[model samples]
Each structure stands twice: as C-alpha cells, then as structure tokens.
Target: SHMKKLICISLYEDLSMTTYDLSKVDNAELIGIVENASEGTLFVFTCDRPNGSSVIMCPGGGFLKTNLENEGIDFAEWFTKLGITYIVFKYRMPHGNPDVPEQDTRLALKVVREKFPEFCDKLGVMGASIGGYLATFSATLLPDDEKPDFQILMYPVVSVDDRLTHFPCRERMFGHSYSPDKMEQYSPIEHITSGTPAAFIVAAADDAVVSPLNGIMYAARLQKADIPISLHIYPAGGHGFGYNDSFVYKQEWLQELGEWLAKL
Candidate 1:
C-alpha cells in the first residue's frame, strides 16, 4: 500500500528577491507524511509569559525528505508545554535549487517577526541535521536584521569539506556539476564569523550518517570567534534519534537546551 506524502512546493512569485529565484520549483515532495502543501506551513504555539522566547524549527531529511513528525511537531509539543512560543515550519525540499530552504526559512521568520513581535523578546531558530545546516548557512547569507538571534542545531551537517561532510546531502543540494567554491560557500563552518548568532548544538559521537565532526567543527569555529556556544556530544544514540525516550541519556540535551535558553 502506498502512503500519502507531504510536499511543500513554492507558491511565491519572487521568494528570493531576484537574489536567487525560487519561482521555478513546483513538484518537490516528501513521501513520508500525510498531506500535500502548496506553500510552507507554520504551526505556532503561544507562550504564557508576558514577553517570552520564540523558536523557528526545521526538521531534517538530508535535503531529500523531511522527518517532519519527529523533529518538528514533536518539538513543538515539548516547547509549548514549557511556556515558550514555537513555530514548526514545513519548508520546501531544495531538490537542486539549494536556496529554496533558506528562502522558506526566511519567510517563516518574516511571519513571526511581523505577527508575534509583541511577545517575542528572544527569537531563535532550531534545526536538525540538514535542517541544522540550513539554519546555520542561512544566517551567514541573510542580512543582520533578518538573522536569528540564536541557533540550536541537532546532529547538524556543518561541513562540506569532502573529508567529514555528508556527501549525499552535498550532492543532492549542489548536484555533480557544482564547483569547489560553491561547496565551501554552503558549509556553515566556513562562513561563521564573530557576528554569527550564539548557538546550542547536540550530536552523537557514533553517528555514522552525519559525522559528529559536523558539530565539533561548528563549535570550534564559534569558540575561535569568541561567540557563545554550548556543545553536547553523547556517547551513543546514533543519528536522527530525535530524543526518543527509549534513548534516555540523549534526553539530557533537552534540559540543557532549556537551561541555556532560560539564560538568554
């Protein structure tokens, strides 16, 4: 039996403002969910506090699909109960159009910034794996005012250096005809600067799917730049665990993230 899919195809005339056109894409779909989305969707949960923090979340699927249920909606459930506003965003899969994810992410931020500013004293973004890669890479590309105030990355793909990067993700995003300069351009570790947002990162040391070095390299860059960063590498839990309670030790990162966010 075939399962229904959830695809986010772009519905904008000029999403990238001619900087990078997202108008040509129409048929990108992920065969893991239950709906067809013509446009990206955001499920926003309001917080109880007078002026609380807000998070824009993106789930991972290696640029080919989306683990939208576990990493996006599950997180929305957890954060809303903690009395923090959160948005679970469904962004377009880039196919070979690499800017589509960031364009969609920027649009999510635009929505929150315009509609929920009254209660959002701290606005940040969180992404897992390829989603994490997009969050970090987009910050480097967006203007200062549009950049997220902070970032949370879980088992991120931080490098495209061939030696430590996830090649499938790289190839899918850039295709085989891309140049070396373009590879480095998409690597978050290469572009992070002192002005890059403070971050909280988590990964598993045994993750063969996405090298733990992705998190290490990004944390090292932030440290060198004297930016605030918190890095947690668990002994196990593998890749894309998404904090299932069965993996008890991995759950500690959730508390650590909450503590870090409280201070921000």
Candidate 2:
C-alpha cells in the first residue's frame, strides 16, 4: 500500500454569533461561540441604521488568540451608535498562520457584500496591534479588485523582517514558522505600493510590545505613495490598551477618528 499523509485542521465546535437589537451595547452583545482557529467561519451584523459606514474589525492578540472584548465588541457597539452597520470580525489567531486571517477576512467581507449590497459600497477596515497588521496586510494582499476602500491602523505591527522590526511580533507572526519568501510576502511595510489605500493611523508613542515604528514606517510609506492619510502619534500610551480607558488619550480618539471618517 502507498503511504498516506493528512494535514488536519481544527474547527471551532460552538460556531455561533449573536447580534443585538438595541442602541446601548452594554445591554447588547454580539457574542461569538467559536473557539479560535483558522478555517473557521464568522457571522456579521447588518442593521437598519441610517447614514452608516461599514467596518470589518480585526482583533489584536499577537497572532495567538484575539482580545474580543475591547477590539471586537466595543467597536461593534459604537459603530452601531454611529448608525454604521459593521461586521465585527473574529478570525483565526495565535495558531494558524500567514494566510488564515487573510482568507477568513476576504470571505467574511464577501458574505457581507452579497447579503447587503445597499450599505453604500463604502467599505472601511480597522484593527489593533497584530490585528492591524493582518488588516493592513489583507488590504494589499487581496486581489486588486477586492481591496478595502480605506484603512485605519491602531498600534500595528508592520514588517516581517525580525532583525529590523519588532522581534517578538515578527517572531510570533513570521519567525521560523514561514520561509524567507513567505515572510517578505506577508509584510505590509515591505510591500506597500502606489495603490495602497487611503488611511488613518494612530500609534501610541510608548507601545513597547509592537514598536512605534510599525505606525511610523507604514504611515510615512503611505504619504510617499501619494496616498492621502491622517496620521496621529500620541505622546505616551503603551501597548494592549484596547478601547477601554487605558489612558486619557483614547477618550478623544473616537471623535478624531470620526472626523477622519468624515474626510473619507
């Protein structure tokens, strides 16, 4: 008999997603049932809200597991308030690599588009930390016709070159896990082009985990590409500070982001 080999992929057993019906998010929760894994499917929320914008949110968890509370739900709640229908994303993290998040991201957006063609076709993406990196990576990596209209990066970990960029982020996301060519391929910083989308980027000056350069380098590259963008670097907020009141800086960030959105 010939030798047989199988590469098994794990699936989330409790695959379920909840959408709320109220304005206040504390009273509402879009709880997801799936555990975290690549190849898993996600659910979305399309609403009857007015003048709404759309955001496909990617949560930050250093490519391990996602921090759903601050990065996913908090954002969903607010966007609903803004009357913006959104797809709060929960993609494979901490385990599946290079292409897993991107695959799920592309598919999830497709699901949203096919379901709600009336949502203005004005799409936007927002992410935090590793989530930001994955979101930015997807904007560029996806086929030209499927790219996002705009991007917002919050304390992202850009670049796959470990020696020059974030050692840990590069290690966790690329590391020995991928070959050299694969590493270069996944890096948004390394691959930025003239067609890179318009963007709004926010970076905390004191983010110790992913490095401030992640924002600095990517934002500068966008400007060089002649892609218009709004870039803000806060003086002193650190890493993993999700939407919660980690610092006074985030209190006003929502308004600033809203103003940026108005520009788009």
Candidate 3:
C-alpha cells in the first residue's frame, strides 16, 4: 500500500523578501516543513486517466488556520479517483499579514501553470469555506498565465457586505481597521467581470455560519455578467462538510459537478 504526501516545499527562498516584510517579524522563518506562518506544501494527486485537467486546491480556515484534512486531502483524493490532477496549496495564515495568503495563492497558480502546461486549458481551482473565497479571489486577481479556467466553491464566504459575510471569517482575514473600500475590494461579488471563470458553487440554506446568500449572490452576478455558472443549495448539511458523501445523501451535487467537469 502506498500513499504520498507533499515534499513540503517553500514557495519563496526567503519569505521576508517579498511584499509583507516578514523579516521584521518572527514567524517568517521556515520551520518544520509545514507550520511556518508563511508557507504550505503542494500535494499532487496523479490521475489514473490523465485527462489534461487539474485543480489547484485550497483548504479553508477562516483565515486564522487551515482545515487541510477535509478541505484539502479529502477533496484531492476524490478528484483524483475521477482522474483529475490536483494540487493542494496550504497557504500562510492571515496573522495580521493580509497580503501573505494571497501572495502564496497567486504563486501556487503560477507554479502549477508553469509546471503543467498540458493542463493549462482545463486548469481550475477548488476550495471550501474560506478557502473557497481564496479560489474565487484567485480567479478575479490572477493574471492570464495563472488564471483559473473554472472555479469550485463549497460554502464559500463570498461577500464582505455586513449582512452577507460570515463576520468572524471576514474579521480574521481583513482585520478590524479595514476601510469600506478595502472591504469592498475583498468581496468576490463586487469583483465579478465578464471574464471571471465559470463556477460551480454549493451551499446549505441552513448554514448560518457562511450564509446561503453568498452562493446566490455570486451566481446571480455571474449570470448577469454572462459567465457560465452552476449553484446548488442543499436543504440541510450546515457548513464545511468537505467531501463527505453522507453530508448530502443523494449527493446530486457530485453528479452535477462531474457533468460540469466533463463539459470543461
């Protein structure tokens, strides 16, 4: 029996040399492979069929930490079984360094694009909870080379509007002093453009944590912008259920996603 874990590589040789000015702070130093405040590993899942499709996976943590088990590895494994290659980018926690996580995420996309040209056309992004926000953010923020072809968001924290966002998650990410415009900048709904990648979004109507309005509003924007999209709102299954089949008994969303993946 064999299982593979990432080699735990650092995206930057010196974490502090970049934008966040980590050298002045203590956590920039790379410690044991994965726990530094500035780094994460890229775990790859080899596809059995090698369909030239890949997804850069991100796990959500409300920006304070990461839920790698359910959000990263579990989904990575599921996608691989269906012959989709995956890279789980465990980015830095947003510990007062707002730019660090986005930097890590953008770098991950660039690296994946450079390393796997064959997957370029079908390259996509997937994440759960706050991680969904990151993937969606990447789609909007990335340049041509690193932009995702598709986006998969599970219970995503989509808006920064006071009524729509999961306050705790937003507070952890942008912090207390975020100005109105800065908060607007982080709201994925506010950034939707004609070129925003097609999306597959899932949420629970009863999820008080992240709110179903997020998915609804994002899908509405995509439709208005003429970007292809699919949105699923389950009656129950609260929030952050990752890839657990039991969460949605019929698991219609999986079938729907599979159909979409085939079309991609």
Candidate 4:
C-alpha cells in the first residue's frame, strides 16, 4: 500500500486507423515485449511527496515492440521515492508510420502539462534504446511548449547510419523504401538546436546490441549545440539492462541520477 497511486490515461480518441503487426493481447501488467498496440496509454504514478519534478518514460523495444517491464514499471518505485511523479508511456509501435509514435508523445506532453501541472514544474523525458530516440526526438523536434526540460537516455539509438544504428529498428521505422531525406528527418542528431534540453546519457562500453557510440556521438552533438550533457560509459553490463538488479552499475548510475535530479 506504500506504493504510489497509478492512473491510466488514453492518448487517442479514435483507434480506427491504427494497425499492428501482431495480435493484441490483454496483458495489463505488461512483461516481455508488446508487439501490437492500437493506441497509446500512459500509466501515471503519482508521488506522495511532490518534488515538482516529473518524468515521462518511454521503454525501448526498437520500433517493433515496447519493453514495458524492465524499462517501464521497474522505474516507478524509484522515481516515487525521489518524490518525482513518473509516467510510463506505452506508445504505439511506429509500424512504418513514424508520425504515429511522435503524435502520441506530443499528446502525452500536453496531457501531463494540462492534467498534472503540479508534478510537472520541471518536466523531463527518459528512454532506453529506441525509446531514447523518441525522448531525444521530443527534446529537439517538438515545439517550445511541448519540449521536455531535460532528457535521460539509456543506451539509445542515436543515429540512422547503417554502421551505427540497430538495423531492425531502422527497418521498422523507415521500411525498405525510406530515402536519405527521411533518415535525416528522423535522426535526432540532425535536428539538435540551441533549444534542445540538457541530457543525462548512459551506456556500456561492451554494449553489442546498440552501440555505445550512439550515446557518445549524441553527447558530442549536444556539446556542439551548447546544451548541458552528462554522459557515462560503464565498463561492463550490456544493452537493455534497464532497471535489472543484476546490472553491475545499477547502484552507481542510480546514485548519479538521483544527484542529478536533485540539482535540476
């Protein structure tokens, strides 16, 4: 009963045009990967002690699914303890339509700002893997009012460059027919402006799934844009670690994150 209270919010009014590759399931307490999602849902966790900081979380599963367990729910308790309201965004899979998830994210920001103004005085976005791509996308591409105040990315997919990106994610987002223009359009590095928020990026040097260079290069771009950046590259622990207790650097990263959030 000490756990934070959760409220569910729907992001879309009509789901008629939405489509998914896999059949929809009824797993409310989502674990593993969710491959099919007709609409976006926000699981909002309210902190008993408010710190005036809030985070919208996007769990990564490339563009095909969402890692709701490790990356989404696992973070609720920790953020609540920090007195930060946390919202996990079960965003719709892009399914070759990039605008689908983008629109959902934009709507999520609007909803949080309008419905929970007290918790969002210092709003931030956090994502893992491709979710990092979404977080960064919002930080850079969204309009001023919709943009996040800060970003926290974990082993993100920062570039569409074939040599650097997770290939399946690239395919899921752009399909086989995508052009160079489209790649540049969706690439977060390509759109970093002075308005882009400060960031806290973490990755493992041994991460073979999504290269650590994604974070490194993205940090470099943020530096060039004169945005505040704190990048940490651990020696071990591979990708998709999320909130796994077995991750060697869990304590280290969490402590750093707590300290960072306190200063923000």
Candidate 5:
C-alpha cells in the first residue's frame, strides 16, 4: 500500500546554538536543504507490516545542510515496504560543535526505543556520506545498551584523517583548527571495539567526493574486531546516490540489503 503514517517529534525543548543565520534564507525546505535548524526533528514513517525492525536515517550535506528529499523522504516507501519503520532524523548541523548531532542521534535512539518498542526489536542506523559518519560513530561509540543492532553506511566519511576523509566535512566538524586528540575522538574507526554493532557498508570505487577507503578501512576494522560485516564496493555509482533511481547499482544494493536484514 502507498499509504503510510507520518509522525513528527522534536528532540529538544531549548536550542542553545544556531548553525546558520535564519534570516538569510527565505525557505530552506523548498530547496530540499535544511539549514539554521535550531532543534532536532524526527520524521517517522510507520509500516503496515512490521518485521520488528526500524532505521534512523541521517541525510548528508557535508554538515552544512541536510538533503531532505533525496536522502530523507525518498527512502520511506521502500523501507516501509520491507516491513521496516523508517525515521529520517533531521539533526542539527554541528557548525563546529560536534556534540550537537551526536546528542541528537543518542536522544533519537532513546525516544525510538521508548515510543516504538516493537520496531526496537532490531533497530539500525543508516546514512550516506557524512550522515554515514554519524551512523558509524553511534555504532562504535555509543553506550552498549544504546547501540544500534546494525549500521548501513553508503559512501560514508568514516575518518578525520586528512588522507582519506572529505576535507570539507572534517573542517566543518572541527573547524579550520583542531587538535590531534579531537580528531582521534571524532574518528569512528579509532573507537571500534568488541561491543561495536554489525555493519553493512557500500561504496563505489570511483567515488571522488569521499574516498572508498573510508568504507573499506571501516569494514576491515570491523572484521578485525570479529564484528559481523557486509561490504560491497561497486565499480560505479559514485557518491551521494541515496535512494535515487539514477544510481546504477540501486537494485543490486537494495536486494543485498534486503538479504542482509533477513539474515540479521
């Protein structure tokens, strides 16, 4: 069925900081880009036939904005059809305060577990690009009880290392100047431990925006830690494909993901 229910919820009562000047834009949503977000928002899409699995999705826009249409809303129908309750988390941009998005993710997970216990039986996090970074960050760093059951990363910026990372994302998160310790702290690969969740990472070998090594290295690390992982490196389909029909490997990735989730 095409009909699905939407629930909107706020993550914070008081927004302490501003990531962008609100007066500068007439309407961010019209352009499918969200900026100047003061509070985190969750747009939940409920499925008619639930498989007791849910996903919290974070859309990527280099931490400067979120692509609500391509990366957020587009996946709702597909995921719900798989009996997965989907949530598009419109998290606040870091704007140099890395804690903002991190807190939003943590809080969203908590709220989802409490409010949608049925879906919580096997909750996962999914994202593309920097959003993928956030997903992996939560998988590796969040408290054991709060960790996601799995993570799906699509061309994620998985490292802060200047060699492998998207420089703009790195600069956006830590600003023009940052300490080595700060880099280590935000880098998800550095934090992977025995408790880290299973992961399904996909990327393209020719992706120029964010190196494919990000996902490759992350999968390597997960394997080293004996964590369950499924890594797919497509020969094409570059970066930021999200749920777009134009991506060449869209069907293949979706089928593989469906198979992976079933086995989970």
Candidate 6:
C-alpha cells in the first residue's frame, strides 16, 4: 500500500508546490506534499525479498518541466515489476532551483528510514537530464553519512562546464543565479570520491543535450575513486526518452540495472 498518504493532507498542484498522497500502493507510492511551480512529493517503497533493498528510479523532467505521469511513475512501476521496491520522488522542477531537489531527495530517504527502518536495506538513485545531474550530486556530494548503495544514470548531465555541457539543463539546475563556484559545486565529476555509490552510466554517444563526455568523465572518476561504475554508450537513441519503448534501451535498460544490482 502507498505509505505517504498518511502524512500529507491532499495532493494538489499549486503555484508554490504540488503534493499527492496515493491511497494504495502495492510496493511504492509517489505522494504529493507541496505544489506550485516547485511541487514536492514523497516516494516510498519496500522490498519483500530483503536482499538489501535499493531504490531504482528516475527523477522527472529536465528540471524545467517534468513528465511525472510518463517518466517518473513509469520507472517506479518497472522497478516494482523487478521485485525491487521503488519510489519516484517528484519534487520541484523546471523554473524551480537545485537545493530544493536535493533536499527533496534527502527527505524521501529520511522518512522511508523513519517510517520503516528495514525498508532501506540499501538505497540507490537515478535521474534523467538535469534530474540526472541531481542524482549524481546525491551520489557524490552528499555527506559521507548519507549515501546510496548504488545508482543508475540514464543520459545524465555530468558536467557544468561550458564545453561538452548541457546548456539549458545547467541553467535550470542552478536556477537564475550563475556563478563559477556554484557550477563546480554542482558538477558530479568534480565532487565524486571513493565513498560515492557505484553508478551504472548509460548515455547516447551522440546526444548533445547531455554529452557522452559526461558519462566518460563521471564514470571514469568513479572508477578512479575505486567506486564501481559501468558505462554503456549506445550507438542510437538520444536524450530524455525515459522508459520510452521507442528508445533503443527501452525495457532492456531495467534488466541491465537488475543484473548490475544482483552482481553487486
């Protein structure tokens, strides 16, 4: 059953936030908490197999506009099919800012742990585009005390550099204020370390929205840090096709991740 409904009053979209507390969830729920342009929601899921559970998911949107119904829920549902408890944490996006998304991620973990101590046997994260950027940050820049056990980045944006950069994505993630310091602060390739989670990186080698260089740099950094990382640069399929059947990876992507998890 969906767990987050017990906490939130209602799930409605407003100018400030959007929230939805799903009534029933077999293994997970994307319940709304706040709405507006910067809607925030909570994601909760549990695994019955108990082989160290992990959240395999994608944060919706490029962080400009989100595809919650399509991308976020689609991913979570696929995880449940894999017998992996999954929740799509739909926080603020688009015209929203960066720190908001990060905090939303942190809160999802906190509540899951507090509500069900055994639920997070292990934690993992993933996102697409700017959301992918946030996911990488969660894996790398998080305090050592708060880290995922694994991660999957699908066509992620790994760099904030002007070269090999996702220009619009960078603008959305950092918000209106632009600065060199903040750019480095948000770049995944810059902050990664040995303590960071093992990441499975997938990217279209030719996509310009988020470069192949991004996958190369971030995955390589994780490898250098002694963090387990695998990269699959596809010959076809461009960016932002979350769980798209038309996309080359499509359903196969989840299977790849499941295999990665089993080996880990």
Off by over 4 Å in 6: 1-38, 45-52, 94-97
Cα-based TM-score, every candidate: 0.83, 0.82, 0.84, 0.89, 0.89, 0.80
Candidate 5: give its CA RMSD in angstroms: 5.6
**Predictions: Cα RMSD each:** 7.9, 8.8, 7.1, 5.3, 5.6, 4.9
Cα deviation in Å at residue 26, candidate 4?
A: 18
Instruction: List per-prediction Cα lDDT, in the order shown.
Output: 0.71, 0.67, 0.72, 0.81, 0.81, 0.64
Worst 10 residues of 6 by lDDT: 2-11
lDDT of 1 by residue, 101-205 (tens): 667877778867876786467788888988888788756667778888899999988777787788888778766655677777667788777668999999888
Which residue pairs does candidate 1 place in steric collision?
Answer: none
Candidate 4's residue-wise lDDT over 92-130, tens digit each?
Answer: 887877676578778889888988889888999999999
Q: Write the per-residue lDDT of candidate 5 for residues 1-264, one digit (tens) a residue.
A: 531566667677532322222234333442333333334877777777888889999889888888777888778778888899988888878888767657878998998898889889999999889999889888987988888989999899887877677888777877766666677777888889988999999999999899899999999999999999999999998888888889999999989998998899
lDDT of 3 by residue, 1-264 (tens): 012233333566532222222233232232232344245556565564567788887887788777766676666556766667767677777766556656877888777777667756588888888888788888776665566889999988777678787777766766675566776667778888766899999888898778888888888888999999888888998888877776863368788888888887
- How far residue 237's Cα lies from its native spot in candidate 6, in Å, is 0.7
Model 2 worst lDDT run, 10 consecutive residues = 1-10
In candidate 5, list every pair of residues with a backbone clash: none
Better of 3 and 6 by lDDT: 3
Query: Number of clashing residue pairs in every model?
Result: 0, 2, 0, 0, 0, 18
Per-residue C-alpha lDDT of model 6 across residues 231-263, encoded as one tens digit per residue: 887777887777778886765766777788778
- Candidate 1 least-lDDT 10 residues: 1-10
